[PDB]
């Protein structure tokens, strides 16, 4: 089989400035009819591979001017000359020359935006879900960058542990920013003996943590 | 107009049986071929195999070989992958993809479908409702959102007011929950002005467990 190595694994570009992403085939990837069938795709999470080039230089039709490929060999590039925020994702070199068909590892493109602070939004626990005697709270971390955030969980200004479960969301192909959501769960039990809930944030674009709190009973 | 519509996800025991499907449109079904491509975790992306619609003629990756089974029906243009022997290692997304210019490229692709493989039981989401409040407004803003607990397997999707709603959204990769089940969260934030005259209704869908809940999030006093 024909082995696709692609280097770096992993990029982080400023918007206007180019990248550059490798692709390497184990043996020469010349399909019989003399064409080498080598392509670009990139996938966002959630959604489906999207092509960018094809046979190793030819652009897609709406693809922009920005993305060109080239090579010769074992050797192929993708380069993008200025970077835009609808770039991120995984970036994919293929070959279609030889059976079986083979992708490359892939390369993550992380936009290198301008640092902005979260904004922070706390959520109760619902009448329904109380009725089943647990009581969850969300504290939401609005688009940040850079990715790096930390959140504590404080019930009557004391710190929580073991009761919190945390989700990042992949970069935002519009303003390159993250957001983060963080559940407190608690029983219906623990959740009556406290007036207080609190979420402390800390990230790079805060001079001081936020608190963004609630009190129980004013709901 | 071309679209290839593929089957909701899938939970099967180990060493069963799952057959995902590709409904072609927008083309005629038989002119090209259908491929298959598996993107399981640690694993990028795989071709599997290629379908000739004309006459059913397969060409397999070898790793796939007596794992794997391609098939198409021509009177309802669907392709079909039917993989037996299940094990952890094929809980993926199955993609099933077109080239419309010979072998030149894969221009058109399915959404995909998540197989989990597993001898645990389908169990349908708890949702609840993120109210927005005081405490979740900011500059003129409002954030409200939708909590889903307590699911197994994964996906459930999740759109708001029917897919009309999606500037704002934050839709979160689930979270694993010590029992095995997962839980995800769902926000969206919109101006805090018509919270009075907007309705914000979250769609989740659970297909393992064939469940639908359109979830009304409403104000607090927070
Ligand atoms: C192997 N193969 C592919 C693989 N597709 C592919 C797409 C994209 C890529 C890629 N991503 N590079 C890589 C591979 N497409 C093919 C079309 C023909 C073709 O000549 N005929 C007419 C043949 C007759 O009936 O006489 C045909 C047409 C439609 C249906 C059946 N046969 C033959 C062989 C083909």
């Known amino acids: 089989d024909i082995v696709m190595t692609q280097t770096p694994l992993s990029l982080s570009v400023t918007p206007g400035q180019p990248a550059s992403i490798s692709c390497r085939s184990s043996?020469?990837?010349?399909?019989?009819?003399?064409?080498?069938?080598l392509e670009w795709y990139l996938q966002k999470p959630g959604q489906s591979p999207k092509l960018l080039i094809y046979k190793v230089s030819y652009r897609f039709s709406g693809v922009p001017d920005r993305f060109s490929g080239s090579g010769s060999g074992t050797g192929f590039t993708l380069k993008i000359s200025r970077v835009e925020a609808e770039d991120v994702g995984v970036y994919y070199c293929f070959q279609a020359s030889h059976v079986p068909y083979t992708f490359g590892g892939g390369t993550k493109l992380e936009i290198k935006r301008t640092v902005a602070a979260p904004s922070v939004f706390i959520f109760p626990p619902s009448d329904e879900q109380l009725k089943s005697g647990t009581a969850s709270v969300v504290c939401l971390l609005n688009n940040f960058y850079p990715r790096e955030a930390k959140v504590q969980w404080k019930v009557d200004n004391a710190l929580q542990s073991g009761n919190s479960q945390e989700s990042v969301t992949e970069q935002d192909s519009k303003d390159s920013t993250y957001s983060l959501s963080s559940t407190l769960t608690l029983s219906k039990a623990d959740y009556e003996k406290h007036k207080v809930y609190a979420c402390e944030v800390t990230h790079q674009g805060l001079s001081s943590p936020v608190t963004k709190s609630f009190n129980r009973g004013e709901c | 107009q071309v679209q290839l519509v593929q089957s909701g996800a899938e939970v099967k025991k180990p060493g069963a049986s799952v057959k995902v499907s590709c409904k072609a449109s927008?083309?005629?079904?038989?002119?090209?071929?259908m491929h298959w491509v598996r993107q399981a975790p640690g694993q990028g992306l795989e071709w599997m195999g290629e379908?000739?619609?004309?006459?059913?003629?397969?060409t397999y990756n070898e790793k796939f070989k007596g794992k794997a089974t391609m098939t198409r029906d021509t009177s309802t243009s669907t392709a079909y992958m039917e993989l037996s022997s299940l094990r952890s290692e094929d809980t993926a997304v199955y993609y099933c993809?077109?080239?419309?210019?010979?072998?030149?490229?894969?221009?058109?692709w399915g959404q995909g479908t998540l197989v989990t493989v597993s001898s645990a039981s389908t169990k349908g989401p708890s949702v609840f409702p993120l109210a927005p409040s005081s405490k979740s407004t900011s500059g003129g803003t409002a954030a409200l959102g939708c909590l889903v607990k307590d699911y197994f397997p994964e996906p459930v999707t999740v759109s708001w007011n029917s897919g009309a709603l999606t500037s704002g959204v934050h839709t979160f990769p689930a979270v694993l929950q010590s029992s095995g089940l997962y839980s995800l969260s769902s926000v969206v934030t919109v101006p805090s002005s018509s919270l009075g005259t907007q309705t914000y209704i979250c769609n989740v869908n659970h297909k393992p467990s064939n469940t639908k809940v359109d979830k009304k999030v409403e104000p607090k006093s927070c």
């Open positions: 927008g083309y005629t079904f038989t002119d090209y071929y």
């Open positions: 043996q020469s990837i010349v399909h019989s009819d003399g064409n080498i069938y």
């Open positions: 379908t000739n619609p004309r006459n059913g003629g397969t």
């Open positions: 993809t077109i080239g419309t210019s010979g072998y030149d490229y894969f221009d058109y």
